[PDB]
C-alpha cells in the first residue's frame, strides 16, 4: 500500500528558509511524477511544484518559480522541496503527493501533510484560565500562545463526551481558543473537572482544576 | 492559463438527496478532469480520474460526466459518509488548477444554542486582563448572531468569535464568543450580558451576570 510521510513543518521568519522531505514506500518511487500541493483556509487547494520520474524536468508556477525549488533522491525514495525568502504568504499545508504518471498528471496519493508557518511572532506558551459557573457547563480559556498547535484535554481524556473545542483564532499577535465541557449537575463539584493543556511547540503543559468561585 | 469555476460553494442537503457539482473551465480541456473528496483533518481523497474513470472502491453512486468546459459531478444519492469537501482539478495544462471547492452540509432540525456565559478567571484579572465567555452550543442551522452589552449599551470592540464544524454526530453547530477587555473597564462597569438571536426563536435568547 502506498504511502507518504512529510516531514519539516514548522515557525520559521519572513525571507528565512526551509526545507520539507517527503519519505515514500509501498511503491516504486523512480517510476512517478512526484508533487507538492499546499492548502490554506482562504486560497484552498494550490499546486506548487512537480518534478519527474527521472528527476530532469521540474515545474513550478509563477508566484513560486524562483524561490521554492523541488528534487528528489531515487536511491533514498525521498522527495524534498527547498523554500527560501518565505513571504507571509507561504504560510500553509503542504502535501507531497504522487503522479500517476512518470511526468506530472493528476494527484492519485497524498501524504498526511505537514505545516509551515512564516511570521516573526515568537514561540510563546499559552496562559490557561479555568472557567468557572440538568447538567452543568464548565470551559477552559487558552489565550495568547503561538504557532499551534496546542492540545486540550478534560481530565486526560476520560472525558470525551460533551466537549467542544473551538478553532484557534488568530489574535493580534498569539493564538487564543477555548474549549467547553458539559457533565451532569451530580459529578460537579462533587467530582473534580480538570482541563489540560500541552502546546508542544514550548515543551510546555499545564493542568488547570475547574474549580467553584 | 486555465481557470476552473466551480459551484456551488456550499450547499446544504438532507440524507439521501442527489447531490450535483458543476466545474466549467475556461479552456477546453478534453476529458481531463478529476475529482477529490476531503473530510475535515485528513488530506485529498481521489475519487474520479481523467475520463470521468471511477477510481477503485469509490461507492457506484458516484459519477461525473463532461468533456470541453462543462463538468459535472455527482452523488446518487447522499450517505452520512459524503459529507465532505469536493474538489474538481483539471491536469490538462500546467499550472495545475482546482476548482474553489463545494462544502457540503448535512441539513437537520433546527436546534436552538444552548447558552451559557463566564465571568473572567481570578488569576486572569490578577495579570490584569479581564476576558468574558460565552459558549452557545449544539444548534442549527449555523447562522447566529451574538451581541455583547456591557451595562445596556452595546459593545464592538474586543470580540472574537469561533465556530466549530458541523458536528459529526448530532450535525449541530456551536459557537464561542469572547469579549476581552482591560481589567480597568472590567472593574469600572457592572451588568454584562451575551444576546444571541437564532433561526429558533422570535425572542433574543439572552444570558448576563452582575458585579
Known amino acids: 500500500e502506498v504511502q507518504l510521510v512529510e516531514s519539516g513543518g514548522d515557525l520559521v521568519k519572513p525571507g528565512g528558509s526551509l526545507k520539507l522531505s517527503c519519505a515514500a514506500s509501498?511503491?516504486?518511487?523512480?517510476?512517478?511524477?512526484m508533487s507538492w500541493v499546499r492548502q490554506t483556509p482562504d486560497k484552498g487547494l494550490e499546486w506548487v511544484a512537480t518534478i519527474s520520474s527521472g528527476g530532469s524536468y521540474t515545474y513550478y508556477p509563477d508566484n513560486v518559480k524562483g524561490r521554492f525549488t523541488i528534487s528528489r533522491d531515487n536511491a533514498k525514495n525521498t522527495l524534498y522541496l527547498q523554500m527560501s525568502s518565505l513571504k507571509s504568504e507561504d504560510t500553509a499545508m503542504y502535501y507531497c503527493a504522487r503522479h500517476e504518471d512518470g511526468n506530472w498528471n493528476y494527484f492519485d496519493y497524498w501524504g498526511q501533510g505537514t505545516t509551515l508557518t512564516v511570521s516573526s511572532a515568537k514561540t510563546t506558551p499559552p496562559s490557561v484560565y479555568p472557567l468557572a459557573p440538568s447538567m452543568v457547563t464548565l470551559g477552559c480559556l487558552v489565550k495568547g500562545y503561538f504557532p499551534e498547535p496546542v492540545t486540550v484535554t478534560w481530565n486526560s481524556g476520560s472525558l470525551s463526551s460533551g466537549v467542544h473545542t473551538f478553532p484557534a483564532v488568530l489574535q493580534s499577535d498569539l493564538y487564543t481558543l477555548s474549549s467547553s465541557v458539559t457533565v451532569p449537575s451530580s459529578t460537579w463539584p462533587s467530582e473534580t473537572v480538570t482541563c489540560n493543556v500541552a502546546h508542544p511547540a514550548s515543551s510546555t503543559k499545564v493542568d488547570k482544576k475547574i474549580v467553584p468561585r | 492559463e486555465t481557470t476552473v469555476t466551480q459551484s456551488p460553494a456550499s450547499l446544504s442537503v438532507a440524507i439521501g438527496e442527489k447531490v450535483t457539482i458543476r466545474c466549467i473551465t475556461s479552456?477546453?480541456?478534453?476529458?481531463?478532469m478529476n475529482w477529490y473528496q476531503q473530510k475535515p483533518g485528513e488530506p485529498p481523497k481521489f475519487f474520479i480520474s481523467?475520463?470521468?474513470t471511477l477510481r477503485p472502491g469509490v461507492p457506484s453512486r458516484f459519477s461525473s460526466s463532461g468533456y470541453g468546459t462543462d463538468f459535472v459531478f455527482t452523488i446518487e444519492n447522499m450517505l452520512s459518509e459524503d459529507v465532505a469537501d469536493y474538489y474538481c482539478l483539471q491536469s490538462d495544462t500546467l499550472p495545475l488548477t482546482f476548482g474553489s471547492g463545494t462544502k457540503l452540509e448535512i441539513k437537520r432540525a433546527d436546534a436552538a444554542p444552548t447558552v451559557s456565559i463566564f465571568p473572567p478567571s481570578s488569576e486572569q484579572l490578577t495579570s490584569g486582563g479581564a476576558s468574558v465567555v460565552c459558549f452557545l452550543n449544539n444548534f442549527y442551522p449555523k447562522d447566529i448572531n451574538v451581541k455583547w452589552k456591557i451595562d445596556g449599551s452595546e459593545r464592538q470592540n474586543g470580540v472574537l468569535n469561533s465556530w466549530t464544524d458541523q458536528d459529526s454526530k448530532d450535525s449541530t453547530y456551536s459557537m464561542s464568543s469572547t469579549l476581552t477587555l482591560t481589567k480597568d473597564e472590567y472593574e469600572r462597569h457592572n451588568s454584562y450580558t451575551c444576546e444571541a438571536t437564532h433561526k429558533t426563536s422570535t425572542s433574543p435568547i439572552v444570558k448576563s451576570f452582575n458585579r
Open positions: 479552456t477546453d480541456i478534453d476529458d481531463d
Open positions: 481523467e475520463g470521468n
Open positions: 509501498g511503491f516504486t518511487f523512480s517510476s512517478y511524477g
